[PDB]
Amino acid sequence: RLGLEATKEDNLPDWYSQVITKGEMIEYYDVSGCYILRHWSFAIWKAIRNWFDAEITRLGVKECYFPIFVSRAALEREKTHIADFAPEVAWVTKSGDSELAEPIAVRPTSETVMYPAYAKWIQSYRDLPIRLNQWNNVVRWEFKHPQPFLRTREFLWQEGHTAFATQKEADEEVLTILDLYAKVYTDLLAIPVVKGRKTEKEKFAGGDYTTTVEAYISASGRAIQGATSHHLGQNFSRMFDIVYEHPETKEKEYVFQNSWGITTRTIGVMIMVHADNQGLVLPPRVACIQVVIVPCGITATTTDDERRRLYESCRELEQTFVKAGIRCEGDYRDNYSPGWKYNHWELKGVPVRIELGFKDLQNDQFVAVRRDNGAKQTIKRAQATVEMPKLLETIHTSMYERAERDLQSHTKLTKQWAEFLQFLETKNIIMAPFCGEISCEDRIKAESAGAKSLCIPFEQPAKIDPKVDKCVHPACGRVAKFYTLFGRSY
Amino acid sequence: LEATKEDNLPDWYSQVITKGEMIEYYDVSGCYILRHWSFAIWKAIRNWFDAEITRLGVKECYFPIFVSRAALERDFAPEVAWVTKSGDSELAEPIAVRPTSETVMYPAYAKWIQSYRDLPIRLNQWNNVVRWEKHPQPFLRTREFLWQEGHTAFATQKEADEEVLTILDLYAKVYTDLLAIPVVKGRKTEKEKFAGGDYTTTVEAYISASGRAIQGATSHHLGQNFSRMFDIVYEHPETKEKEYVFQNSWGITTRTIGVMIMVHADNQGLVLPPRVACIQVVIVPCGITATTTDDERRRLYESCRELEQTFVKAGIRCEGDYRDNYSPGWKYNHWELKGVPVRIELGFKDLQNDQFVAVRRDNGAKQTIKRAQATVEMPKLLETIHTSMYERAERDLQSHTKLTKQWAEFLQFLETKNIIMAPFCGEISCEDRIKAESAGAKSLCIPFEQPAKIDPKVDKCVHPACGRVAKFYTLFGRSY
Ligand SMILES: O=C(C[C@H]1NCCC[C@@H]1O)Cn1cnc2cc(Br)c(Cl)cc2c1=O
Ligand SMILES: O=C(C[C@H]1NCCC[C@@H]1O)Cn1cnc2cc(Br)c(Cl)cc2c1=O
Ligand SMILES: [Cl-]
Numbered sequence: 001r002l003g004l005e006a007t008k009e010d011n012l013p014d015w016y017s018q019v020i021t022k023g024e025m026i027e028y029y030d031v032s033g034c035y036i037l038r039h040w041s042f043a044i045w046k047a048i049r050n051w052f053d054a055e056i057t058r059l060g061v062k063e064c065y066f067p068i069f070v071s072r073a074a075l076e077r078e079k080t081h082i083a084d085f086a087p088e089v090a091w092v093t094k095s096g097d098s099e100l101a102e103p104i105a106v107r108p109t110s111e112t113v114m115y116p117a118y119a120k121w122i123q124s125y126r127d128l129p130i131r132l133n134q135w136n137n138v139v140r141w142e143f144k145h146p147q148p149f150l151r152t153r154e155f156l157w158q159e160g161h162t163a164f165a166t167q168k169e170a171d172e173e174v175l176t177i178l179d180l181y182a183k184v185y186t187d188l189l190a191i192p193v194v195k196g197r198k199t200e201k202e203k204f205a206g207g208d209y210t211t212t213v214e215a216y217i218s219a220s221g222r223a224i225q226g227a228t229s230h231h232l233g234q235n236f237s238r239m240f241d242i243v244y245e246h247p248e249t250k251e252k253e254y255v256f257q258n259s260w261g262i263t264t265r266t267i268g269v270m271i272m273v274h275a276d277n278q279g280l281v282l283p284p285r286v287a288c289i290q291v292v293i294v295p296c297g298i299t300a301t302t303t304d305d306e307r308r309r310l311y312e313s314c315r316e317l318e319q320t321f322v323k324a325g326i327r328c329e330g331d332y333r334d335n336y337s338p339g340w341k342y343n344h345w346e347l348k349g350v351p352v353r354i355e356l357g358f359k360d361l362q363n364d365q366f367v368a369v370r371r372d373n374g375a376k377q378t379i380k381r382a383q384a385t386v387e388m389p390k391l392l393e394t395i396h397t398s399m400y401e402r403a404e405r406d407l408q409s410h411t412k413l414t415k416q417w418a419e420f421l422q423f424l425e426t427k428n429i430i431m432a433p434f435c436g437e438i439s440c441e442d443r444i445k446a447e448s449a450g451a452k453s454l455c456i457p458f459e460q461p462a463k464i465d466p467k468v469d470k471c472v473h474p475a476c477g478r479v480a481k482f483y484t485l486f487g488r489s490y
Numbered sequence: 491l492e493a494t495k496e497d498n499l500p501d502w503y504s505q506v507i508t509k510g511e512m513i514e515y516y517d518v519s520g521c522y523i524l525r526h527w528s529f530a531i532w533k534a535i536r537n538w539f540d541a542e543i544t545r546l547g548v549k550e551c552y553f554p555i556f557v558s559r560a561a562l563e564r565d566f567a568p569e570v571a572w573v574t575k576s577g578d579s580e581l582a583e584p585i586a587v588r589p590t591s592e593t594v595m596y597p598a599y600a601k602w603i604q605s606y607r608d609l610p611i612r613l614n615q616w617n618n619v620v621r622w623e624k625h626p627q628p629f630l631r632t633r634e635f636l637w638q639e640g641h642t643a644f645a646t647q648k649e650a651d652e653e654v655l656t657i658l659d660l661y662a663k664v665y666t667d668l669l670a671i672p673v674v675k676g677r678k679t680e681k682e683k684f685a686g687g688d689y690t691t692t693v694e695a696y697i698s699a700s701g702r703a704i705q706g707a708t709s710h711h712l713g714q715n716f717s718r719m720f721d722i723v724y725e726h727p728e729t730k731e732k733e734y735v736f737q738n739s740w741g742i743t744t745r746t747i748g749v750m751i752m753v754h755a756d757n758q759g760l761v762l763p764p765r766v767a768c769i770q771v772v773i774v775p776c777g778i779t780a781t782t783t784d785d786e787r788r789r790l791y792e793s794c795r796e797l798e799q800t801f802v803k804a805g806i807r808c809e810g811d812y813r814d815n816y817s818p819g820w821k822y823n824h825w826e827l828k829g830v831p832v833r834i835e836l837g838f839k840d841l842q843n844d845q846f847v848a849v850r851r852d853n854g855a856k857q858t859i860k861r862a863q864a865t866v867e868m869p870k871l872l873e874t875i876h877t878s879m880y881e882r883a884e885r886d887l888q889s890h891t892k893l894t895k896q897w898a899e900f901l902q903f904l905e906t907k908n909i910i911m912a913p914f915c916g917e918i919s920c921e922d923r924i925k926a927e928s929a930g931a932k933s934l935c936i937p938f939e940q941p942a943k944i945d946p947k948v949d950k951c952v953h954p955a956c957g958r959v960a961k962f963y964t965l966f967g968r969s970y
């Protein structure tokens with residue numbers, strides 16, 4: 001029965017709403033900007049969270065929890081960014097019917113609370129480094145048009161905050177966290193990305209520099225930051241008097257800080273990239289169910305003893321899949337036809353469906369069907385334990401390389417501004433030589449109406465030969481500092 | 491440690507949670523920073539329970555932190571935090587920070603249950619709620635706190651009842667098997683039960699320093715009350731009479747940690763139950779004789795590293811302390827304060843005789859183990875520690891639960907700092923009079939394991955103003 005009524009290419013938003021609802025991944029909510037994560041998508045987040053947490057604790061980071069409320073003073077004292085952020089802050093100002101003396105803010109991030117804590121907690125050189133992480137929820141009252149995973153007012157993330165004695169420690173951590181974020185996207189979500197440094201405009205305002213992983217959703221034609229990992233350097237230490245006495249040098253020494261974060265926006269990217277016109281398509285490594293066994297060949301008058309015999313062999317296959325470490329469940333609901341179940345689990349996006357009927361068990365075998373391809377492969381029951389991991393391996397690769405192919409089909413390089421704007425009009429992203437200065441990024445953005453910097457990619461396409469190369473914008477005559485990636489932004 | 495449990499309980503509690511690196515104070519009242527050392531106790535409880543209820547068929551989801559006014563108001567009302575402005579721009583309708591999630595998840599349950607085919611719904615959340623509720627205290631009276639709230643809907647009341655009991659069994663197992671704290675399973679009286687429910691089961695535990703009892707977790711049977719409120723119904727297949735589902739909800743909060751502090755922490759700081767301690771064993775290398783020798787520094791640190799490595803690989807959570815800028819005794823006191831179940835003192839004579847001394851945080855008892863037997867004695871040891879803690883608490887609690895049918899000794903026992911099983915009518919009127927004329931004592935639970943069977947030919951409720959035949963024996967005490 002249930003099915004997608006729209007298509008990715010013609011009506012992307014209604015397609016997206018149909019895939020997150022009929023994929024049982026989201027329920028809408030009477031508070032705007034906020035969405036119910038039903039269990040089918042929360043398991044995606046749970047896999048991402050668990051994987052990344054295991055990584056950063058193996059690294060020596062530790063898990064903590066600061067309160068959801070922040071003082072007006074914690075917030076505004078020594079402002080990180082008066083910026084244009086203060087409007088986006090959710091303010092509690094009444095208990096029941098009693099208004100409170102000073103109002104308290106729901107956290108948008110925890111710098112202004114965790115940095116005073118670090119100032120207390122570091123009274124000597126011996127107390128360093130501090131590597132603390134929280135898995136928490138934040139609220140940003142963002143005046144834009146909201147969407148389930150991509151622009152939400154409350155969302156889950158993890159924020160890691162770190163303080164070291166040396167800048168070398170801090171630099172290397174920034175890159176180790178970025179490698180793990182990159183792994184979240186490629187190895188778990190089968191999504192390709194570009195590692196880079198934000199330009200001076202797009203960097204976190206308070207940081208020394210800001211690294212990032214950036215991805216592209218081509219169906220929409222827009223690019224999106226997938227995760228970031230900042231090097232604050234000494235800015236916040238000097239702000240918050242996070243100091244120790246140098247063991248040799250008698251003089252006060254400020255610590256070197258990093259912060260890094262990744263949000264549930266990841267899941268939205270996963271949809272936009274991998275979900276097709278029949279519904280969701282889950283990367284095998286985050287799917288709550290990797291393999292679903294639908295017992296087939298049950299007619300309106302299949303008998304309870306026949307039904308039970310088949311159900312029982314299905315549970316035995318499901319069990320030897322669990323014991324092989326792969327996440328398999330069987331669907332034994334009696335008020336649903338085999339075909340109804342095929343369509344159900346297709347909408348839900350399970351990498352593999354197993355059709356096992358009476359004719360299959362009589363030949364001691366089964367059929368496996370890929371959610372991405374529709375490709376069917378008959379496996380002898382014996383080879384199950386060895387064939388099914390290969391398959392799930394294969395499925396990931398196909399999902400990934402397909403996605404990367406699309407990304408490379410939507411990355412065009414030019415040194416000429418006209419070819420830049422042609423490429424941008426044709427719905428893709430452009431590596432071009434950029435002076436790096438903020439004014440020129442502004443002129444570029446205005447004059448593509450718009451196109452923002454994405455990152456200065458780590459893998460540069462070529463080294464700028466200064467005898468020739470000038471920044472792609474004709475109004476600045478600055479020689480090109482590097483290749484930068486520009487595109488229309490989310 | 492500067493104060494003591496026996497004489498000044500509150501400032502002892504404050505010194506135990508501060509010098510234990512568990513809590514950092516915060517400029518919003520009611521709210522406290524869970525540092526990593528206490529957050530790990532929560533994480534152990536969280537993971538143990540989540541695995542259990544996941545094995546049971548419950549599934550994890552996450553609903554928003556915000557409820558807007560309409561969702562909510564469909565009697566606690568003073569205690570609700572209201573967002574009403576973004577920045578300096580006032581918002582049209584104000585939204586409440588969730589204090590519990592019934593008013594949000596139950597409309598969703600009505601929308602998602604379009605047929606009988608859709609049952610049961612078994613969903614759990616690990617989330618933060620705020621109830622702007624006195625004189626606050628870090629794990630016992632917090633305005634923002636962590637918990638898990640699970641909400642479930644079935645077709646029959648039998649499923650729902652049996653689940654209530656299974657979850658209560660799991661909470662008691664949290665308290666006894668993980669936190670080594672004894673508890674009593676029971677039913678709240680109609681006065682103390684969850685207002686919207688049919689009934690409320692509970693586990694209660696005893697803190698002897700205070701002489702007071704505290705509710706450790708709950709598991710409610712909402713019956714058909716909330717289904718009827720929010721129209722969670724299905725078509726009866728036979729005659730299509732709208733049928734209301736039977737609902738339960740259950741919860742457990744970070745109050746556990748506070749209970750575990752107050753039950754088990756002594757005058758030297760925390761002492762963590764082995765099954766929740768982030769570090770079960772900490773290795774302190776001894777005898778570094780301050781530049782008496784330097785090459786040996788790495789040699790000793792290295793033998794400590796292979797012992798820690800074989801403890802990890804044996805499944806024992808062991809970390810070693812190889813920091814050079816701290817006195818050995820400083821490390822002893824540090825890990826005593828933080829409550830690490832076992833300290834290993836390992837020196838040069840120890841490494842030369844192929845052994846180590848492990849000393850229990852609860853006992854102070856010292857026991858020298860040959861490295862050969864290490865992987866085998868150390869699990870036993872930690873098993874041994876848990877039992878001694880639990881039985882210790884058990885001893886204490888049962889030396890302080892008194893049975894009576896007479897109000898005079900009820901009120902004497904209540905002066906002597908313990909909790910009383912007495913015959914009770916069950917009425918709300920009479921419970922109110924009991925608390926008022928005991929100043930004060932509330933019902934705790936009607937225990938499942940009853941002390942003797944009520945003979946209605948004689949037994950009357952212990953309060954002299956109600957002459958009702960006693961409905962049952964219940965447990966009363968002074969409580970948080
Ligand atoms: O949130 C950040 C910076 C970093 N915080 C720690 C986790 C990783 C993260 O990149 C950027 N940022 C973004 N949005 C914000 C919104 C508001 Br409102 C405020 Cl006050 C502040 C901020 C703000 O600082
Ligand atoms: O929160 C509860 C009832 C149950 N909710 C689901 C998880 C288990 C839990 O016992 C009781 N309770 C307690 N304190 C409250 C405080 C406020 Br404020 C509000 Cl609005 C409501 C409540 C409220 O309903
Ligand atoms: Cl977001």
Ligand SMILES: [Cl-]
Pocket residue numbers: 203204205
């Ligand atoms: Cl930013």
Ligand SMILES: [Cl-]
Pocket residue numbers: 629630631632635743745
């Ligand atoms: Cl509490």
Ligand SMILES: [Zn+2]
Pocket residue numbers: 434435436437440441471472473476477478
């Ligand atoms: Zn330029």
Ligand SMILES: [Zn+2]
Pocket residue numbers: 914915916917920921951952953956957958
């Ligand atoms: Zn009575």
